[PDB]
Ligand binder design. Structure first.
Ligand SMILES: Nc1ncnc2c1ncn2[C@@H]1O[C@H](CSCC[C@H](N)C(=O)O)[C@@H](O)[C@H]1O
Length: 255
C-alpha cells in the first residue's frame, strides 16, 4: 500500500504518525499537495521531503486547515469569561495550555482575556504546535486585521501597536506570559496540573480512536475542577467515564 509505506516514512522524518489521522482525508490533502508540486507518487514525494527541509516544513504547515483568528467563535469566549473563569480561578496563578495554537491567535486571545481580569493572581500559557513555521509567526506576534475582526477595539488598542494600516503587533506585556513550544499531542509527554486546556480545531483531524486516547491524557493533565475547552464542532461522549462533567457546551470540568 503506497500510503502505508509513505506513512512509515513520514513518521520516521517528523515523528507524526499519520495512522492517527483520518486516512481518506489526510491521504487526499497530501496527494493534492505533492501533485501541486508535480510529484507523481508518494514514493517520489517522500524522497524529496528527506532532501528538502523547507518542503518538509512546508508540508507540516499544510497538513491541516490552519487559518485562525482571535476569539474564534467569539460568543464561546464570553462563556469562558463569565461562566468558566469563576469555576477555575483560585489564589494561585492560572496555568493554561493552548494545545495546537497554530499562528498564535488563540494563545494571544487567552492572554488578553486573562490580563483584563483585575486581581487574577497571574497567568501562564504554554502554547504548542507541531508546525514550526506557525510557531515562528506566533512568536513574532504580528497580525493583519483579517485575524482580529472579533477583537473589541479597546482591547486592540490596549494590547497591540498598530504599525501600519491593517497591521498590528502584540505588546511584550502579553508575550511575556506565553511560552511557544514545539510539541506533538500524539507522541510527546504532557505537562500536568493545568487549570485550563484549550484544544480547538485539531481533534477534527485525528481518528476517533486517537482523540479518545487524547481526552483521557487531557483529563489527566487537568487539576481537579480545571476545564477543557474544545472547538465548536467537537464533543466528548460519556465525559463521566473520563471524570469530566460538561460545564456549558464545549467546556468540560474535571470533577
Ligand atoms: N499531532 C499534533 N500535535 C499538535 N498540533 C497539531 C498536531 N496535528 C496538527 N496540529 C496543528 O493543529 C492546528 C489546527 S488549526 C487550529 C488552531 C487554533 N486552536 C484554532 O482554533 O483556530 C494546526 O496548526 C496544526 O499544525
Amino acid at each position: 500500500d503506497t500510503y502505508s509505506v509513505f506513512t512509515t516514512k513520514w513518521k520516521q522524518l517528523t515523528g507524526v504518525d499519520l495512522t492517527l489521522y483520518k486516512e481518506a482525508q489526510m491521504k487526499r490533502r497530501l496527494t493534492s499537495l505533492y501533485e501541486k508540486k508535480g510529484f507523481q507518487s508518494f514514493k517520489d514525494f517522500a524522497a524529496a521531503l528527506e532532501k528538502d527541509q523547507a518542503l518538509l516544513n512546508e508540508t507540516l504547515d499544510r497538513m491541516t486547515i490552519n487559518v485562525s483568528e482571535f476569539y474564534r467563535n467569539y460568543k464561546r469566549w464570553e462563556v469562558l469569561e463569565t461562566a468558566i473563569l469563576p469555576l477555575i480561578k483560585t489564589s494561585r496563578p492560572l496555568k493554561i495550555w493552548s494545545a495546537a495554537c497554530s499562528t498564535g491567535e488563540e494563545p494571544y486571545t487567552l492572554a488578553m482575556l486573562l490580563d483584563q481580569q483585575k486581581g487574577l493572581p497571574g497567568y501562564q500559557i504554554l502554547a504548542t504546535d507541531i508546525d514550526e513555521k506557525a510557531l515562528e509567526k506566533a512568536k513574532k506576534g504580528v497580525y493583519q486585521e483579517r485575524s482580529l475582526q472579533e477583537v473589541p477595539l479597546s482591547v486592540k488598542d490596549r494590547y497591540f501597536t498598530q504599525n501600519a494600516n491593517r497591521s498590528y503587533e502584540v505588546k511584550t506585556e502579553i508575550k511575556k506570559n506565553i511560552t511557544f513550544k514545539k510539541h506533538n499531542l500524539l507522541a510527546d509527554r504532557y505537562e500536568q496540573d493545568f487549570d485550563l486546556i484549550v484544544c480547538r480545531n485539531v481533534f477534527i483531524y485525528f481518528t476517533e480512536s486517537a482523540k479518545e486516547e487524547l481526552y483521557l491524557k487531557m483529563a489527566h493533565s487537568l487539576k481537579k475542577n480545571g476545564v477543557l475547552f474544545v472547538g465548536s464542532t467537537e464533543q466528548i461522549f460519556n465525559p463521566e467515564k473520563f471524570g469530566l462533567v460538561p460545564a456549558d457546551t464545549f467546556f468540560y470540568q474535571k470533577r
